[model samples]
Target: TYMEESAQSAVDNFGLGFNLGNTLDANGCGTGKPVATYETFWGQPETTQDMMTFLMQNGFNAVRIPVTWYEHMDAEGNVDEAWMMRVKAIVEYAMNAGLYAIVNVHHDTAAGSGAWIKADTDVYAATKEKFKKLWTQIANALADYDQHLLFEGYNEMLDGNNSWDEPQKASGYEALNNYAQDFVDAVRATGGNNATRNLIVNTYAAAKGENVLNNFMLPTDAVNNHLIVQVHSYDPWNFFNTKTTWDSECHNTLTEIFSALSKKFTTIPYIIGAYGTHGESDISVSKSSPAEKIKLAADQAADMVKLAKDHHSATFYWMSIFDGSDRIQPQWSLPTVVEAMQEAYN
Candidate 1:
């Protein structure tokens, strides 16, 4: 019942808060080339501000800003002050607009390093130390903020076949869970709001359904229940995003996906989410229109809510803005989705 625990903690200690998806920037994982124009991505000073405003106005009560601290962290563990300012400014915008926010270590140590999970014991120790310093600096910087500002241990660590399969001794899933437990211990010891603030721990790469059920382990600690576990429901990724499901499961099969999760984790409160129908379909052979895609995504959300009533679900979605094309459909612009979310939460 992590969701209930987090919700109660928020109310008791901070009043109110919202859980949100990891709204990755165009420079997702910090290694990819910026996906949007400079104006839309990080080049523009006000880009993050505008996006936060858009989310707040659209019924989003909170945003999970996944930042690659390594992009701003030096080899010596000193963080770039300017980069810290940039992140702080956007978080300020979200808070100013009456939205809660979650910021975390994303793609910092885990994204670019080949065999991030396979490092020697010494390498592993250094990686863990680097992670500690990263979060120590971040938590210190944001300690002044109220409890509404949440901290996530990590984002989608050790995802996909390469990272998951290469590790022989440790399962990618188990290692990440171990890392998260260590992170919670490290951040909590930092001794600020970090000690009491609601923290989020994600399931294996935040891949919902089986990935979460299979990989998740509640850390052993005094604050274990205080952590909220996150999971994304982009089931059949190809079907949800590309509209090319020639070999993928149908929407009904997608429904069955969450149904299985509901049956397994009836006691664990979690988030059921999606990116909608992966943007607009352009092919004449497509069976769904843009409008229909919106409705269908909304339908999936509703179905998730129904599933939650029979299980434990703290719901959220994958995106807050569309990339304006199908290359990777952002879930933010779909109006039906917004309406559907409000209805589902209600």
Candidate 2:
């Protein structure tokens, strides 16, 4: 049996995380294509150890390898061996680079983009079985990994109506918790290093709002202390999408949200699983100037890192720091943003 790392050590080692998104997590693949086909379907390069090493060289100590398993699985949700092997390779790359690795069932939750797990009480029983089978396979596959690797149950799950109603008003929270409970049970049942592998569970849609967090409950764990919580946000949406002035008001929402998160986080430390400006990533339409977009995005990302640190949380930026071929050069398309974030953390 593996001796689990303390929650403090887990958070400490997760100093900073860079998400390897849109790679494995890019969905929409038909069953016929090879696993490699799904990897680059979204335009990111096939993940490489060099890229993982590049991330560590530049100060990120963690990598969230978001993976969409639905498209790679069979009708009954059995993940393909080839796909699992490829994902194992990706995780190995991060661990070889000495980065804490986080793997999750991305795009598999109720994103309305064709996902299996929906947080509705009526469908909960059926969904629970599928979720368990998937996680059981995943946990057993990675069972040998030590504390350096962690598993997240699912991502951004919502009700069958695809709504974010609170627990008091709807059964969404109960169903979500039910999934969490099963996630722990399945992963724990694998029995190995997995016995103590720290796990992460998400809030509704990984939202930062009060009702969602207030209702978020930890899945009862056999080994209680080895778990964490996660939430995501694309804050100051006006700045990200509308190119508005990122002024004082932009910081207000996150301030209250993280404060509340910190208070509740006393029991199980939380991490902002994904956060970054999505709109500004494009250079064609708005915030169009490279430097202008870089500065604005960097400022907020830096602010987020600082706030996350102050609030006792680690954060992983949403996706894309390096694009195809850029990882070959080990080059950063947005050096300023990550630099600003690293500065804030230190």
Candidate 3:
């Protein structure tokens, strides 16, 4: 078994993470898609080792790679080995750059135009096996990687309808808990570094709403304190994008979410797995010039970092540094935002 550390220690090292979104996680790539072409299938250019190096050289110390495997798998849920190897290569790009890397099954849990991972008993009963199978392949593929690599069970899982604002059905929470248990068990059974690797679990819809947090149950880990809670924060979108000041609206929402996590899952650590405003629209809508927008983005980024730090939670900025081409070579699309993030960590 690999040597293990506390979840807090993992978060401490994680510091701040960046999501390499919309790339590996791309779907609907037509039939029999080739692995070589899928890297840039989502309109972004193919990921390069230099991009990973740039992220590390700048400010981000961790990378969250969101991936959807359904299109790359056979009818029996067997993942394509070529696709798996490609993912391994991309992960190594980050790890080799000395950045913590997290990979997760993304956008594949939907059923009829909505999320299949539901709160209903029958839905989970029918789907739990498939979920386990998916994780089994994923865990085995990356089982040998060291602690810098982590796995997230699912992304933004919701009930029958794609909503987390409605009344949460008890069955939904129960199903989610079961999913977490299966995820942990599947990974641990792989019998490698995965046995002790840090794993992350999400709440219902991965929302900060009270119903989700109040009713959510963390999975029981065979190994103690090896799991981290994953949650997303994009509250008060208008405020995040347009408001000039960091007011109580943002502060209160973040405070409530962190406080609830502390109260409910007292011993566990958490990560703001995804958090960022729309840098483009936030700048445009504000009618500010590029120079002005830079300052605004930087200020907001700093505030977010400080808030996460205050709660003892590591934070990851959502996809924002890219300018449609590269996140490194031409310098960041928004260097000030990155500078603010680096400042917060320092």
Tell me the tens digit of each residue's lDDT in model 1 across 25-70: 3233442233233214533222355555666666556666666555
lDDT of each: 0.54, 0.81, 0.77
User: What TM-score goes with each of the models?
Assistant: 0.71, 0.93, 0.90
After TM-score superposition, the amount by which residue 51's alpha carbon in candidate 2 deviates from its true location, in angstroms, is 0.6
Residue 18's lDDT within candidate 1 is 30
Give the alpha carbon lDDT tens digit for every residue of 1-346 in model 2.
3457966578767887888878898888677689879999988878889988998888899999998888778888888999999989999998899899999998887645778787787778877888899999999898888889999999888877677434434588888888999999999998888888999999888887777877778888777688888998776554666664456777887787788888777877889998777645442211234677667788778888888888878889876555566766878767777788889988
TM-score-wise, the better of 1 and 3 is: 3
Decreasing lDDT order of the candidates:
2, 3, 1
TM-score for candidate 2, please give it: 0.93
TM-score of 3: 0.90
Per lDDT, the best of the predicted structures is 2
